[PDB]
Ligand code: HEM
């Protein structure tokens with residue numbers, strides 16, 4: 270139920286304990302007026318400080334002038350903050366606007382085409398994103414809906430994705446959640462307590478080349494459909510061999526406990542864990558923060574199921590790209606398809622009550 | 632933590648409203664009555680396991696390596712989470728298996744209502760399973776595994792995820808708010824009101840269809856909200872649509888949510904005034920719906936609304952008269968019914984030897 274502090278050197282919703290629910294929206298910018306966009310960033314930041322404390326935006330949800338629309342849409346009245354975090358990111362396409370071309374970080378790389386990609390252009394890209402995570406889905410929807418309303422005329426929602434349940438962990442002391450393939454997902458991540466690893470692998474440093482990004486991060490989002498029909502007819506041995514961990518405990522093959530260290534040479538050469546492990550990728554390490562989704566049926570008599578994969582890293586070129594390139598031969602490829610993609614530069618934190626989202630860029 | 636599966640009635644109607652919903656409609660692909668009976672029995676055995684927080688069949692792991700696991704494993708480590716699974720039979724089922732003369736008269740086809748825009752792909756269905764639980768992964772796991780068990784005899788026609796309150800953060804005697812920001816459920820049948828359930832919800836032997844005694848009839852309507860239109864309405868316009876104020880949810884001219892309405896103080900086409908039993912010859916419903924938010928549509932608008940579920944003793948004397956009276960509802964400006972289905976929900980599973988549909992099939 271508790272609030273997560275909004276202010277800091279970093280944005281919340283990265284290193285923060287992973288909340289149960291996601292509402293992710295990508296927006297395109299429709300104004301060419303730099304001042305109007307800056308004004309929106311400040312208004313959004315004011316709104317975020319209310320939302321993340323469990324207060325209504327503006328003058329509230331009722332008790333205003335009868336003849337005016339309420340400032341807050343009202344559907345979160347009476348609810349707790351529910352660990353709401355709101356994390357903003359800027360897409361490569363933003364930097365074609367407002368005279369920003371030379372401020373595009375080098376670490377904000379366009380992804381190459383990967384084998385098996387089938388990206389829907391409508392559900393890819395975006396000038397900016399707001400990741401809303403909370404333990405209560407209504408708290409999350411309310412936040413996105415109110416930001417979008419505030420931004421009417423200046424931004425439009427390009428695409429959105431709801432995540433019903435987490436498939437990631439930044440808290441190794443708590444139970445690791447399972448994805449819809451039935452495997453624990455997040456055992457070997459970066460914990461929010463591992464300050465050293467976060468500095469090394471997640472946060473952008475001044476020396477990395479883009480001063481406005483110091484204390485920020487870079488985000489890859491991949492919408493991945495799961496072929497659950499195909500998977501569910503696979504044997505238990507096939508499923509475990511795909512990953513290199515057992516299904517029940519989620520231990521590395523041959524070992525007894527989830528958190529025992531993998532012995533990679535005992536795994537199949539195309540096992541997912543073997544291919545994705547930092548030791549297989551010159552040390553490349555990622556903060557995974559994904560969620561599961563289901564968007565109805567596929568119209569062929571089956572449930573639609575997927576994973577909305579979210580990875581944070583210090584540089585896309587040294588994080589997600591080398592790892593996913595190594596997954597070219599992954600056994601898991603038989604059971605998944607990447608159907609949406611976007612990258613974002615996640616700026617530094619809102620330092621105090623006088624700061625605002627994007628202040629270091631603008 | 633768990634809701635008993637067995638009883639004179641199915642759970643998931645009069646039992647406490649859980650925080651999450653996964654509702655699936657299925658179509659039957661077999662013509663063999665024996666094969667369908669066999670499926671109902673296997674489903675009933677699976678439901679008994681699922682609602683006690685156990686895996687289906689021989690489990691999710693620890694079987695024969697070369698066999699697919701019986702349970703897909705994504706609920707391992709979760710609690711039962713007050714899961715209830717409620718089955719219903721659509722009118723189209725009765726054209727199979729020689730059941731045409733056992734269709735209840737109370738299982739009426741709905742008339743076309745003014746402003747209906749029903750998507751045929753997200754309407755109807757031979758049968759439904761309503762899975763309610765506090766943890767949406769428990770609900771999804773249930774649906775996924777029933778669908779798997781039934782593969783070859785049934786397919787999933789459509790499905791819907793929903794949310795109500797989050798019980799860990801929100802007191803249970805608090806009325807939830809719908810996505811228009813109004814309290815929703817203040818004047819409803821409560822599962823404590825045994826005599827009102829007998830009068831208005833449960834089918835009786837004398838009603839004309841003996842196999843349905845202790846069952847009920849379900850109407851499902853997928854009702855989209857025009858969120859962005861609504862949010863531009865004045866507070867006075869919003870309150871005038873309902874006949875209650877937004878902050879407290881009191882009837883106009885009254886002070887508290889639970890004060891009894893004075894219908895003449897409301898506008899003639901206010902929703903509460905039109906839907907109230909006194910405006911409908913005493914017709915009263917048990918509402919048990921959930922909010923949804925599915926994502927954003929092609930225009931950048933929020934695909935959100937109310938997955939409305941009503942239980943009643945007879946569709947002709949419950950939903951039909953009430954929805955007919957909403958022809959002129961002030962709310963119609965802001966909503967559209969886009970999917971519909973009706974089901975006969977049979978009596979409960981009496982004990983460990985009984986099975987879903989036993990009173991119909993023998
Ligand atoms: C539907 C898609 C995927 C599924 C089901 C999945 C599943 C898993 C599972 C079960 C683990 C083992 C437990 C763990 O340490 O988290 C794992 C580990 C991992 N995955 Fe994936 N994953 C998927 C996609 C991806 C993608 C797209 C990437 C990166 C490009 C990735 C990178 C990793 C990494 C880095 C690990 C940890 C390896 C280690 O250090 O031991 N995964 N995944």
Ligand code: HEM
Pocket residue numbers: 809811813814815816817818819852854856873875892902903906907908916936937939950953954966
């Ligand atoms: C999106 C669609 C709808 C919304 C947002 C909505 C909202 C509300 C709200 C705010 C109330 C007042 C509080 C309470 O629950 O008592 C209400 C009452 C009610 N609604 Fe609706 N409703 C919708 C659709 C329907 C439909 C389709 C029916 C039935 C056909 C219906 C039947 C009722 C009834 C029977 C009451 C209680 C009236 C009374 O006895 O005081 N509603 N609804």
